[PDB]
Structures are given as structure tokens and as C-alpha cells.
Amino acid sequence: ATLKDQLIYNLLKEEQTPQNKITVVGVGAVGMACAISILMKDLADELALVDVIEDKLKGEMMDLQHGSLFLRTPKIVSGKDYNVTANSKLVIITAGANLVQRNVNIFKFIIPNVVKYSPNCKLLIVSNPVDILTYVAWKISGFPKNRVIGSGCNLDSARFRYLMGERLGVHPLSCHGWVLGEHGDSSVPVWSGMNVAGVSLKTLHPDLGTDKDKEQWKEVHKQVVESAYEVIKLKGYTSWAIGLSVADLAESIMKNLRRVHPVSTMIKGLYGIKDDVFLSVPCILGQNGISDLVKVTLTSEEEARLKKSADTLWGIQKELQF
Template sequence: MSVVEVIQSIDQNYVRSRIPRVAIVGTGLVGSTTAYALLLSKTPAEIVLINRDKRRADGHVQDLRDAEVFSHTTRVVAGHFDDCCSADVIIITVGVSQSGQRSRLESLNETAAILKNLVLKVARCNPHGILLIASNPVDVLTYAAWKWSGLPPNRVIGSGTSLDTSRFRRRLAEHYGVASDNVHAYVIGEHGESQVPVTSSARIAGMSLENFCRELGLPHDEDMLRKIANDTRATGLEIIRAKGATYYGIGTALARITGAILRDEHAVLTVSSLVPESMGLGEVSLSLPTIITRDGVARVVSIPLDVSERHALEASAETLKQYIAALKT
């Protein structure tokens, strides 16, 4: 082992021996809600809120510290961008607001210009940190962040369809009358219009949906499953049109992903990351069931798909690749 490798190893071991640090860049609705969700999850960490308007970050910190006494394991501070250099996880939430009048892919280049500058700065000073992208369109920007940063693909993750998967499971649970944590089903592909809710390999109590219905004497209604899938796809825009933005769900999803990283959980989550060549989808970032560890992406899992789901996933990948090709920065 060379001297440089020894020093890098020592640096990495030091980073892992101290209290983990999570830097949240952008303290709008999503960033501040993510900090609150992390606080409630009692994830042992120091949360650093970073915002161009320092006064806003300070205000959030004062408010969050009133909740800090109930957590005991999490500390919240306001910081500067330099704090990203020593962070274990850097969550980028800038530019995530949606108007409800534009798709996630329409505002791509505007958000990309902001994001590129941030990503380049982080990559230069923190080669061991994990980038967690929440900015939309998240799949395209996760891919772009990986290209810009030069970081290994396992260290650049997007929130992806983690929120869509939770919405899908909740709707299935409500329909079948079971607790949502007993439903194992995934939404894959793009976090957006071309997402693919997978019903063919969905399971309740270890049984396919069809077998579960047969066991309980329930009707297996394919039309209802299609409605659940469509409702899942439309939920985000419905919330935006009703109240202007979504933040509770995505903030909690980001906290869940961050906790899985810091606790080295080996949890299976549908995050966006660079798709392995073996998947046959080309060079693109999108969501698939993924094992998340302290090093980020440990493995992307291939789940069984029926013919229509496979075609839909391929179409989703092609849609994202078109927008990647149109990226101007």
C-alpha cells in the first residue's frame, strides 16, 4: 500500500469514528422538513443547515432546537458550504419546488446550472462523502451529478422513487386491508410521468397479489390495480395543486435514506443511481431496488418483471436518456 493510500485509509477511518455529519444544502420546505424528519428519527448525527440566506438557516436552527431536546441523539446547527467538506452525507435540495404547471423535466437546465456549481465544489473537497440528490428532475440530475463530480457511482444517489414506492404500498395496503409494512412492492424507473409501479412481483405475506386474494376469498381486480398505479403516479401533482408543494413525504424519504447510510443498514430502497450495464438499459440513472450501506449503493437488485413492465421500464430509461442528451451544462 502506498503512502497516499495509507493516508486516505486513515482519513476515512477517522471520518467513520466521529459523530456522523449530514449537510443539507438548501433550507426551503424540503430541506427544513428533511432536517426535522432526521431529528424525529433520532439518527445519531450532526445536521448542518446551509442556505444562501444565512438568516433563514439560523431561523430554522432555532426552531428545530426546540425539538432537539426530545431527540437526544441529533444536533442541528447552521453552517457554511465549507461544512460539506467534512460531511458524511450531503443532501442537495436546491431547486426542488414544483409549480404544478410544469413537468419535472421542463425545468431541467435551470436547476442543472445551479446544481453543477455545488457538486463540483463538494467533489473537490470531499471525495469520501455521499451525495444525495433531491433536486428535480432527480434521475437526470443524479446522472449529471455523477458525471460532473467524478465520484464513484455508488456515492451519488438520488431520492428516486422512494416516495412513489411508499405511496404505492400505502394504496395497496388500503385496498387489501393490511398494514403497509406487510406489502412488498416497488415503483421503478423515473420519478415522474414514466414511472413503473410493479404489480407482477408484488407480495403480501409472501404471496402474489392474485394468490393473496384467492387465500382470503377476495376478488383479484386488475382494473383496480391499474387505478392504484395511476393514482400513485398522479399523487404528487395532486398535492402540489392543492397546497403548492410536497415536502413531508420527500423529507421523510430523504431521512430514511440517510439513516440507512449512516447505520449501514443494508436496507433495500428504490433510490436513483447509475444502472449497472448488466440491466441492459444503457447509461442512465433511474430507480431500482437497491441495497444501501455506509458506502452508498452496495448493489442494484433485479426484480422479476412481466413483459409489459419490462417494456415500460425500457421506455422510462429512453425518456430519461433523451433529457440527459439535452442537458446544456
């Protein structure tokens, strides 16, 4: 008899399926930071990694497996073939190649393959331009709107709260503030909702977020955009902050928490938007993905900025060939 058979008596060999499986597509700095953060948060019983660069993919999988002793995710798998992703509860897309067209072409291959092996999964899109690519994943997959989630303004809001926390000398967890709309350069800081312990900063300081503000709090949102380009300039890419923010969304979904996050969802029917566009609003996240969304009261200016983003996104999206 083998040493294994001498040591262990088997009761049954019955075929089993993962109960809390997560797949990460694209093993670049973003995908790998998502992976390590998900692993250290014990959110999955199985992690699958997919990429087109086979050697890097194998190396990344092996490196994570070598740290198994320090984790509570018993199975880590990888492959170019999507059969490794079968029965995933959540599929995170961090894969990426004007730039719009080549990322749409990457999705044309990825999304049907994801849908084939995990037809009941929630899709979480991180790849940029995130608002266009969440629409692209929704269009290709044929999934209901609740199961197609864009990372959207989750990171923008996290950076905003970090900067707010630094100015006030308070932990970001206790500094509330929402950055909504189009992810990136065109995002909207909702000044009316910025508060500490339910105390509105705008009520205390009516000049908040205006050019007349002597303390120039508008700079806090300007620094959210500036910080992102600064990190790229300094280290060539960003990874840690996005990975942590994605694992926070993954936690709400995997644990059915029904916490509210600023993520990209199909906004048709709000703020005079009549087109099939995805923009960030506060969404309730759980086991069914986006089950509900918060209807934020926006000022005329804020509403106009979301409508302008929606018009620009639809302008690009109506010319898209699938």
C-alpha cells in the first residue's frame, strides 16, 4: 500500500463543487492586488485566475499557492481556458489591452466564456473606461442589470474619504462623503452629503465646494483626480488601493451584507437620463449583486454634470459594434 493509504482511510471520493468561488480575469498589478486582498479577507473557498500570458499566469498562481499555509482558501487554480472558472459566484474583470475599442474587443472574447462556465455569477468590472466596459459586459452577457457591477466611483470615494480624514484628523471610516457619476476626471463630489457624525459640513460652511470657499475644499476632489495621476507618475501603475476597494465590494456580495457602495449601475430613468448608460450611484450590494439603489438629491449643477457624462458615454456607446 502507498504511504497515503497507510496513513489515511477514505470514507468517500464523491464529486464536489466550490460553494464560494471567485474568479479574477487579468493577472496584472490590479488583478493580483484584488487576488491577495480577497485571499487575506477569507472571502472564497476557491480562487481561479485567468490571463492570456501563460507563463506569468502560472508563476502568479504558484506564488499564491506557496503561501497556502497562511491562508484559508484551500484551492487556487489558473488557466487560459475558462473551464477553471466554472461555478464562480463572482467574476472580477481586470483584463486590459482607441483604448475603448481594444478593451471592447477583449470583452467580446472574455464575457461569453465567463457566462458559459458561470451563468449565475455576478460580474464585477474594474477594467477602464469602467462605465463603458460595464455597459459592454451587460450587453454581451445578457445578464439582468443587478448582476453587472462596475467598480465605478468606489476608489474615487475611498480616496476622497482618506483626504477628508487627513484634513479633519479623523479615521476615513468616520468621514462620510460621496463621489458619484462618471469614474475618473469627470466624477462629482456630492458636497451636501459630506459629514462627520451626521453633522453636515455644507450646513456649517455654506461656501463648501464653491470658488468663494476660503479653505478651498474643492481641492479635496481635485486631489482625488491629481493623486491618481501622481501615483502613475511615481510607480508606473496603481494596485494596492484598487485591490482593497474591490475586496470590500467582494465582501458585501459574498456575505450578502446589503451595505451601500458607490458603484456603476444602469442609471436610465434618473436625472433626466433616457439612455442605456452606467454611472455610479450608491447601491445596496448583496448575494444578488445590486438589489437596490439610493436616489440622491442632487443640485442643478450636479444633475447637469451626470447628464453631460451620460450624453458623452451614450455618444461613444451608440457607435459600438458587437
